[PDB]
Scaffold this active site. Structure first.
Site, PDB file in Angstrom:
ATOM      1  CG  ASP B 290      -2.154  -0.991   1.029  1.00  9.79           C
ATOM      2  OD1 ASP B 290      -2.642  -1.571   2.102  1.00  9.79           O
ATOM      3  OD2 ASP B 290      -2.541  -1.276  -0.102  1.00  9.79           O
ATOM      4  N   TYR B 374      -9.309  -1.622   1.688  1.00 16.09           N
ATOM      5  CA  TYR B 374      -8.866  -1.569   2.896  1.00 16.09           C
ATOM      6  C   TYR B 374      -8.966   0.059   3.264  1.00 16.09           C
TER       7      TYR B 374
END
Ligand code: CU
Ligand code: CU
EC number: 1.4.3.21
Lengths: 620, 620
Positions: B290, B374
């Site tokens: 990420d 997420y």
């Protein structure tokens, strides 16, 4: 009406009458322990029978007695004389906290020891310390207390800053005589004071802290009925209080839709020991079972609003018995309130365009106790998402000694010539489980790594394995942080909509367990502390991991004995005993008064619900 | 003014202007990364020189470039053309997120796969997933994204509830080509919706939650100067923001008496990866960096008051660059506030009669980001007692798959036919240390058990040992919870009043590290995640544990390469890299939206101060 209501001053008074009347409370008697017994398994037991268990001491020398009385009928269920040498001595009495110092005052050996160090006996404080069991056969069957001295220059001075090392004494509190006095040599008594309220040490107080106001304009979200029955955001429980264990939680359950679902029948801290790792003969016998030997509940502090508990607080003032059987109220000894706990769930979706955020909250039930130099906060937490958590907060003043010249491998230096012996604070949480009922089992869950090869060509796969603990003989488990080891308590007979047994996962902090040599006296008396988790079959008389009479008990008592019954625990009424603690190597920062440090554990639902239990929380 | 101030809109616009003037930012160019560089070590500069680093992508297929400009001087310091097949592709562009779905929408193979599942292409969303590096030779040197499908029944439907298993496609986002389309067989697409705002699923919302009002009548206790300089309860630090790392803390220092003592020069989450453990070919390639591949800062949410951040909040609104070099402000992207933190210290003394209680507080600096399914909250905390802590909060919607008919060892069932592959969320905290200055060293501290015998007759003794890590080659450490292992960063040249080197102790949570087989692609690409602690010698170009270009980049850069230099770290300018994470086996309670779970670490002073630093904290 509830059989789980707190003990009233009236009930204590009744117990008192029964005892005295049955010729059990003569002027030579002292109540060492008194508490209400929990209801017996079974609902058919209509109409409760409030019973209280009591441990009676005798200043004269007569054998102590364990007595059970019925308050509902004002009678004596049983009374048994105790052979302390066999089953252990009774808990230390608060009225004995001074006897050690008062006795050593008139002892020449001690006075000689003080004189050699040029210390005024009128300024020498003596801590009343548990004796344990060692090579002194003479102490067998006798009620002993050892004493370490600390100098108090004036009435408001912190004696802990001035430990007198190289000296220790043993005393018999009943026969009121000093059995022994040991002087291994003179150590300089640390000169610096440790008075944390002295402007010279604190320096100018900060003026930079702006107030933080926490209020609930519409009152708390939890309701309190029957005096101690709490209902909050689907949770349901009864807050009990015992002089030994302290705050005890009963019937923790969660209202899932149209049904109250039990989770834990009883949760409490069944024991807490503080073992010291200094090999010096002056302290090598040092192990304090604050719970089992001193009874942490009796020393609970009265919590001041705005200082100890901030926000909208609902208090409970538990009542306990004094040494003579009179009821004593512990004003505002239990704090209950809810507090904000940040974000609960959040998601901004790139496809739906929906942005969602919800706040979390936790119900708090706590108390703070003081045992000599230590102060411990016991906190139980209930979260919106079903999580149950316990946290212990250790503070107070560190137990001191002199810091040896040439250094030490078991003592750290806090100030010039001042040392703090290494030690641990180990707790045992007794969890009488009731996941959707009493038919429960425990499984040890380990993460399982997989080898690259057929069926896992890219070597990215990983899994998990679960091992059911079927018999007590295989229910003594150790932690394994490396493999993410946890323990799941489930009900094989109750399944969620996905046809999987409902359960709760216990997450430990995986801190070190008892460090002492396996063959030490403490490893035997505090056997529970050598392993992270124990699972036993429930039994009305197995209340503590160390047994009923911890003081001066030879060892093996408690869990080691229980587990030996090797009973079936696969789909039965079981109890989980989790050991957890802090290993303390005191830092300079811990002196003169230590900042709070914490340890604990939590349990989260594991397939207990059919989906998130917090979808109905409003945006607020 | 301060060289550590946040980047301003003008500075970003100036970078754009400089690049354009230099002929490096034509219409075919795109900014994939742009960030301000930290000032160089030592005052080797007379005045300030704000430098920015940029990664320039070319949509026509030309080679991308790494450039560093001085916005102060309006110059290009360095510009180098990148060979991506060797050093890695640039981070994923937000403008490429929609490309995967668009290209596949008119691909015959994709359409055939969708037709076989009776799915209308207009309702099939395709997640733009990083590709990593595997056995597809044609992907080397090409910018590739892989795609997994999810059905969205209507505009506001949660697509994650309807995963299309057995299908995956690979796409070249530059040449606009679909390279491969793999169909391993049809799987039932889960039918239940996962719309957490639908009354049919949430049920009637609760009306039981009463409000909790948190306010500060006189405002906050901290001050903000220079736009991002914070001063709070003796702490001093600058709050920076980078599009890749998010919130970065600079110059963390503590005012001890009259001297400003540094503790940490720079603290940030330098990388975070989400490796999946499902061996299915449809997801066995999944590993989402990420931070390194997507740039978490770029997706920081605008935080709503009284919702995301409760109380008296001070917001920072960082500005970043858009794909064309135009400044973009993330309104209220960073929250800053102080919150009460229970009891700081407490003691009721039996001999002095003095009852003392003091409350704790912590300064909070945080932001929340969203990457696909997420949502992560990054929180940094500063306590009154000197403790520094980081906490990551993971929430959002779990990544789904079909749940195989015969069960699975690598996937959990969340709803009928709906699965959630096992995975981990592993972070890397880069702590550029400066304990009382730059001359630091790290020691590994383990508890040491002792054998009963001569010098320890009662077997109660226990100690600890510390091993100094002298060269990078011996600084790759692993956790040891059982032995209470911690790591201490100290300054051998700066001692406390007791003649001991001042220091801070890192306490890890000891969660499992990377589970993948050591020979896997992810084990090489995320080598840092295989060990708990790494210590390197500071270097201007060693910023991320995975290197500058993680996207589609094999091993060869990052910590493993840096460590090879085997530099001296015993009393030098060093950097600590701590790996910590969550191992997630999704529970039914995690669906349809998951409650927050957390993980982190903290550092506490260890003989840094000469006594408790909070003795000057007032009553209330
Ligand atoms: Cu301690
Ligand atoms: Cu996860």
């Amino acid at each position: 009406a509830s059989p789980f209501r707190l003990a009233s001053a009236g009930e204590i008074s009744e117990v008192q009458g029964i005892l005295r009347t049955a010729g059990l409370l003569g002027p030579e008697k002292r109540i060492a322990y008194l508490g209400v017994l929990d209801p017996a398994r079974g609902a058919g037991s209509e109409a409760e029978d409030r019973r209280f268990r009591v441990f009676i001491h005798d200043v004269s020398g007569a054998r102590p007695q364990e007595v059970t009385v019925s308050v509902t009928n004002g009678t004596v269920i049983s009374a048994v004389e105790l052979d302390t040498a066999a089953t252990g001595e009774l808990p230390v009495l608060e009225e004995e906290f001074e006897v050690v110092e008062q006795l050593l005052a008139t002892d020449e050996r001690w006075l000689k020891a003080l004189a050699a160090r040029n210390l005024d006996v009128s300024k020498v404080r003596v801590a009343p310390l548990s004796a344990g069991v060692f090579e002194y056969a003479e102490e067998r069957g006798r009620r002993i207390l050892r004493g370490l001295a600390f100098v108090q220059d004036f009435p408001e001075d912190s004696a802990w800053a001035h430990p007198v090392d190289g000296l220790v004494a043993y005393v018999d509190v009943v026969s009121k005589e000093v059995t022994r006095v040991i002087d291994t040599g003179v150590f300089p008594v640390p000169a610096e004071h440790g008075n944390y309220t002295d402007p010279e040490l604190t320096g100018p107080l900060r003026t930079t802290q702006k107030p933080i106001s926490i209020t609930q304009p519409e009152g708390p979200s939890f309701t309190v009925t029957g005096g101690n029955h709490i209902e909050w955001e689907k949770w349901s429980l009864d807050v009990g209080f015992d002089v030994r264990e302290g705050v005890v939680l009963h019937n923790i359950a969660f209202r899932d839709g149209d049904r109250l679902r039990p989770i834990i029948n009883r949760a409490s801290i069944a024991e807490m020991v503080v073992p010291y790792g200094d090999p010096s003969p002056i302290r090598s016998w040092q192990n304090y079972f604050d719970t089992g030997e001193y009874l942490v509940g009796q020393y609970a502090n009265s919590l001041e609003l705005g200082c100890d508990c901030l926000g909208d607080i609902t208090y409970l003032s538990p009542v306990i018995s004094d040494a003579f059987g009179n009821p004593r109220e512990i004003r505002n000894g239990i704090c209950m309130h809810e507090e904000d706990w940040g974000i609960l769930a959040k998601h901004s979706d790139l496809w739906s365009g929906i942005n969602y955020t919800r706040r979390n909250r936790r119900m708090v039930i706590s108390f703070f106790t003081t045992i000599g130099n230590y102060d411990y906060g016991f906190y139980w937490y209930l979260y919106l998402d079903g999580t149950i958590e316990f946290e212990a907060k250790a503070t107070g003043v560190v137990f001191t000694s002199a810091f040896p010249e040439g250094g030490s491998d078991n003592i750290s230096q806090l100030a010039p010539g001042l040392g703090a012996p290494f030690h641990q604070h180990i707790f045992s949480a007794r969890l009488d489980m009731a996941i959707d009922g009493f038919t429960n089992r425990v499984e040890e869950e380990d993460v399982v790594r997989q080898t690259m090869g057929p069926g896992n060509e890219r070597g990215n796969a990983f899994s998990r394995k679960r091992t059911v603990l079927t018999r007590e003989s295989e229910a003594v488990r150790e932690a394994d942080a490396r493999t993410g080891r946890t323990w799941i308590i489930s009900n094989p007979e109750s399944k969620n909509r996905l046809n999987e047994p409902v359960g709760y996962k216990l997450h430990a902090h995986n801190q070190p367990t008892l460090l002492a040599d396996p063959g030490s006296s403490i490893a035997r008396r505090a056997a529970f502390a050598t392993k992270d988790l124990w699972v036993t079959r429930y039994a009305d008389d197995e209340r503590y991991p160390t047994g009923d009479f911890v003081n001066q008990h030879s060892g093996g008592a408690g869990l080691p004995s229980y587990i030996a019954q090797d009973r079936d625990i696969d789909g039965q009424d079981i109890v989980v005993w989790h050991t957890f603690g802090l290993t303390h190597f005191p830092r300079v920062e811990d002196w003169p008064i230590m900042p709070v440090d914490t340890v604990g554990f939590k349990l989260r639902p594991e397939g207990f619900f059919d989906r998130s239990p917090v979808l109905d929380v409003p945006a607020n």
